Design a protein around this ligand. Structure first.
Ligand SMILES: CCCCCCCCCCCCCC[C@@H](O)CC(=O)N[C@@H](CO[C@H]1O[C@H](CO)[C@H](O)[C@H](O)[C@H]1O)[C@H](O)CCCCCCCCCCCCCC
Ligand SMILES: *[C@@H]1O[C@H](CO)[C@@H](O[C@@H]2O[C@H](CO)[C@@H](O[C@@H]3O[C@H](CO)[C@@H](O)[C@H](O)[C@@H]3O)[C@H](O)[C@H]2NC(C)=O)[C@H](O)[C@H]1NC(C)=O
Ligand SMILES: *[C@@H]1O[C@H](CO)[C@@H](O[C@@H]2O[C@H](CO)[C@@H](O)[C@H](O)[C@H]2NC(C)=O)[C@H](O)[C@H]1NC(C)=O
Ligand SMILES: *[C@@H]1O[C@H](CO)[C@@H](O[C@@H]2O[C@H](CO)[C@@H](O)[C@H](O)[C@H]2NC(C)=O)[C@H](O)[C@H]1NC(C)=O
Lengths: 99, 294, 241, 204
């Protein structure tokens, strides 16, 4: 459409298998501002996800922060699925604690 | 030291009939106001967002913005009919209005407008002006906007007088929140490098406020010049996240340390040594099957 | 110093016939506007333009089409005329400023058929002796009667020259059969002179009416004469007795 | 209705003052314009008010504007007979071409002349042609007297018409009544109206 978004998945506190934490998804550099963002646990969408007030930087690029409560483990899969007019298919980005 | 106050307007025009205007307001890196298309009134995201203004002064300022929101929408809707078919839907307008506060009884006020993602028009002095390299078909719409002397007179006042007076009192009202110190918490992790036999050492540092931080990979008194300072990622609790990367040759990890300097710590920097028992104990708490890694 | 002209000043149409109301401005005004004025309302916006090629819908655009072929001309097209479009249409123009400069207007009457279109019958009524004797003044009364539509302009002419002094013409005509809608109208007017002026046999008086009816384009099949845009008159001479 | 004008119509004596009112609900309200429209003529601008509390003057035409009470008033002091027209109030919602104009329905002003010496009379005028038809003329009555139309469908009664024979500096009102009937007499033609006691009914 115009600009492709940049999805960044990171935890608020240091990750510990079993301790509750906050998983953040920071979507940036996208245009137009219409975007569909969802957070996934294993394969299904997380039914209660909070999102910030859609804003923009001094370079006129939009940004929005999505965050949810989660308990990291050795086996449970976590990802941020994003649907934008710039991509023909939704770009899902998994959470890599070492990244 | 120097705080920029910015009102950000996001206006999206899908077609002749559908439109929506959403706005957010900032004082430095802290959100002060929220105004959605679905909301009749402006909402406060801080208890001091009204500043030193009265419930009367704020309501008068509110009504002004309330008629502006309905007027602007029809105004640009008519400017697309004027340019038609030179510019067609969907259209995206962005306004960045406000003022930066400098030491002394002085400030610089701004009003920048971006069309379809690109900065094209600014309010300067007594009129709307097209910036250098702006498309020529914007001349007639700007000539028509400059014909409106009432909007021009109020915008002149709103920038020169209202913005400095409102923000001078906004900083005083929200002193405790702006000057709040949040201690950072750091952790270490490693990922494979793009280069064979190399490893990317990652130092995650999160939950710090204010934004200015110092993070470095050290080897004693030697700042590892390969350390890459990432972007500032925000936290939902109005704090910050930043990570510093270091590409090492696998086997060279022993000896390294992530050193982080912040205002909240008070000289007591966080020195996070790689092979330390604290890291070994930490590393084991975050183990996984590495499924769907990058 | 900023003029706007409209054509025609008056128009008669058949329900279902194409009508084109023209507007012209030589002020080099970019934006042009088409309004219609009706009794009980203000001017309502039908269509407007922002330059040559542009035509945008107004508040009441149903049944109307618009065309801006140049900076100077702007048209209002009625591809299928209806009796609800019977109105008086005003044109305006303007620059980037808020001021709109208005035209003289255009009277449009949309009737079922031209079968009820009739020209007037003019008669000049001579002053009474009772007035001449009592007031030492004399009033001539003109009666333009049995015409349809109400699009008229009555005029007084004495010894060849037009008069405006002592003349008084009804602002509005009156319906002959007020119950009926097709109703043919009547209009009266009076010229008042001095008794000595009327009592002069060398003085010739004439009431001539202007009628805005049919055109050469309009097809006529009825037995009686074609009721085209006509000028009917009646005359009376001064009397010594 | 976003623009309302009161009264719908006003009658004033020649030389007296006229006050016309305009009240609106237009948002936003950039300016208020007052137009003069003669019967069958176009719209001639008289004055434009632009400030929250404005006052303007065009010689004999003066106007106020209170953008808070969203109300304007037009003063026509020492009204002439030529001031008989519809006065329209317009409200513009922008200070440019982007704005829409919101027109009032207008207020009809009727300026009646002073009849210094009323001489009410109903005369019968006969056609110049050998037609035998005729008309009735109610003339020289006071400007206070209003001509009532016919309650009879076969009788046609015109409205009052003031003429001026400039050289004599004399003005007179008149109405015309007629019928295609035999029964119809001029003495009882205008009896639907308020006829003065001293009205002259000459016999034929
Ligand atoms: C929570 C934060 C609020 C978020 C806002 C954040 C962004 C901050 C922007 C600050 C500007 C707002 C102050 C303006 C008001 O004081 C005056 C006002 O209400 N103007 C109306 C009505 O105007 C009408 O009503 C007024 C009543 O006061 C007057 O009478 C006036 O004369 C009359 O015309 C105009 O339509 C607005 C038109 C401006 C358009 C400028 C945009 C540039 C176009 C870019 C070119 C792109 C090309 C287009 C495709
Ligand atoms: C708000 O602040 C702005 C400045 O940021 C003021 O703009 C200035 O306005 C004056 C007129 O009031 C402009 O001056 C003019 O300069 C030209 C020559 O350039 C001269 O020919 C004129 O006679 C006049 O002196 C001035 O240029 C303009 N500044 C800029 C940068 O354009 C504005 O007036 C202030 N408004 C209020 C309400 O305080
Ligand atoms: C104008 O654009 C909007 C948004 O693109 C269209 O709105 C959509 O309408 C359909 C049908 O009513 C809904 O299912 C969608 O959810 C709407 N989208 C949104 C975001 O609200 C609108 O229909 C377009 N109009 C025209 C005539 O093209
Ligand atoms: C954005 O806001 C406008 C109002 O500022 C919305 O328009 C109104 O929608 C309601 C729906 O019930 C109507 O009854 C009003 O008459 C509309 N008002 C105006 C001034 O337009 C609009 O629908 C909103 N758009 C979106 C996408 O939410």
């Amino acid at each position: 459409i115009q600009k492709t978004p940049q999805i960044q998945v990171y935890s608020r506190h240091p990750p510990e298998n079993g301790k509750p934490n906050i998983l953040n998804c920071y979507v940036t550099q996208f245009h137009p501002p219409h975007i569909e963002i969802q957070m996934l646990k294993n394969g299904k969408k997380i039914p209660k996800v909070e999102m910030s007030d859609m804003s923009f930087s001094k370079d006129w690029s939009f940004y929005i922060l999505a965050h949810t409560e989660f308990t990291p483990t050795e086996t449970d899969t976590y990802a941020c699925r994003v649907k934008h007019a710039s991509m023909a298919e939704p770009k899902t980005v998994y959470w890599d604690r070492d990244m | 030291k120097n705080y920029t106050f910015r009102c950000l307007q996001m206006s999206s025009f899908a077609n002749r009939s559908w439109s929506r205007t959403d706005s957010v307001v900032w004082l430095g890196d802290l959100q002060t106001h929220r105004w959605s298309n679905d909301s009749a009134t402006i909402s406060f995201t801080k208890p001091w967002s009204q500043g030193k203004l009265s419930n009367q002064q704020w309501e008068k300022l509110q009504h002004m913005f309330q008629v502006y929101r309905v007027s602007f929408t029809r105004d640009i809707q008519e400017l697309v009919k004027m340019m038609s078919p030179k510019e067609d839907y969907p259209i995206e307008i962005q306004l960045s209005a406000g003022c930066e506060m400098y030491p002394g009884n002085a400030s610089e006020s701004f009003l920048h407008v971006a069309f379809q993602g690109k900065y094209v028009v600014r309010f300067w002095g007594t009129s709307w002006q097209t910036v250098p390299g702006a498309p020529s078909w914007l001349d007639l719409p700007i000539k028509v906007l400059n014909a409106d002397q009432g909007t021009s007179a109020t915008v002149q006042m709103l920038l020169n007088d209202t913005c400095p007076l409102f923000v001078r009192g906004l900083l005083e009202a929200g002193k405790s929140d702006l000057e709040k110190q949040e201690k950072p918490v750091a952790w270490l992790s490693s990922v494979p490098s793009s280069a064979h036999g190399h490893r990317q050492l990652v130092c995650h540092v999160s939950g710090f406020y204010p934004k200015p931080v110092w993070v470095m990979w050290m080897r004693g008194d030697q700042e590892q010049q390969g350390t890459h300072r990432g972007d500032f990622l925000p936290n939902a609790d109005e704090t910050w996240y930043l990570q510093a990367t270091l590409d090492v040759e696998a086997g060279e990890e022993a000896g390294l340390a992530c050193r982080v300097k912040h205002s909240s710590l008070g000289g007591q920097d966080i020195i996070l040594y790689w092979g330390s028992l604290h890291h070994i104990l930490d590393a084991q708490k975050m183990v996984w099957n590495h499924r769907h890694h990058h | 110093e900023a003029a706007v002209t409209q054509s025609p000043r008056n128009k008669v149409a058949v329900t279902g016939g194409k009508v084109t109301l023209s507007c012209n401005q030589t002020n080099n005004h970019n934006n042009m506007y088409w309004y219609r004025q009706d009794t009980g309302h203000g001017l309502r916006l039908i269509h407007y333009s922002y330059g040559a090629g542009s035509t945008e819908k107004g508040d009441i655009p149903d049944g109307y089409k618009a065309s801006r072929p140049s900076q100077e001309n702007f048209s209002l097209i009625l591809e299928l005329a209806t009796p609800s479009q019977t109105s008086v249409y005003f044109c305006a123009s303007g620059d980037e400023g808020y001021t709109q400069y208005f035209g003289p207007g255009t009277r449009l009457l949309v009737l079922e058929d031209l079968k009820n279109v009739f020209p007037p019958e003019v008669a000049v009524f001579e002053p009474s002796e009772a007035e001449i004797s009592h007031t030492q003044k004399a009033t001539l009364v003109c009666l333009a009667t049995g015409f349809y539509p109400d699009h008229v302009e009555l005029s007084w002419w004495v010894n060849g020259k037009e008069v405006h002094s002592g003349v008084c013409t009804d602002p509005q005509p009156l319906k002959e059969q007020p119950a009926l809608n097709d109703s043919r109208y009547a209009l009266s007017s009076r010229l008042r002179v001095s008794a000595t002026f009327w009592q002069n046999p060398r003085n010739h008086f004439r009431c001539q009416v202007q009628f805005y009816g049919l055109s050469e384009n309009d097809e006529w099949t009825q037995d009686r004469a074609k009721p085209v845009t006509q000028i009917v008159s009646a005359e009376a001479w001064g009397r010594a007795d | 209705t976003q623009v309302e004008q009161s009264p719908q119509s006003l009658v004033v004596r020649q030389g007296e003052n006229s006050v016309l009112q305009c009240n609106y609900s237009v948002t936003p309200d950039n300016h208020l314009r007052w137009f003069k429209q003669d019967t069958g003529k176009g719209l001639v601008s008289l004055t434009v008010l632009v400030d929250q509390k404005d006052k303007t003057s065009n010689g004999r035409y003066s106007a106020t504007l209170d953008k808070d009470a969203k109300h304007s008033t037009l003063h026509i002091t020492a009204t002439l007979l030529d001031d008989t027209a519809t006065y329209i109030c317009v409200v513009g919602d922008r200070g440019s071409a982007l704005g829409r104009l919101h027109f009032g329905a207008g207020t009809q002003l009727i300026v009646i002349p002073d009849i210094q010496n009323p001489d009410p009379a109903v005369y019968q005028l006969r056609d110049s042609k050998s037609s035998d038809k005729s008309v009735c003329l109610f003339t020289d009555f006071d400007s206070q007297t209003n001509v009532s139309q016919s309650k009879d469908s076969d009788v046609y009664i015109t409205d009052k018409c003031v003429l001026d024979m400039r050289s004599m500096d004399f003005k007179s009102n008149s109405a015309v009544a007629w019928s295609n009937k035999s029964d119809f007499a001029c003495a009882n033609a205008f009896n639907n109206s308020i006829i003065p006691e001293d009205t002259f009914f000459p016999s034929p």
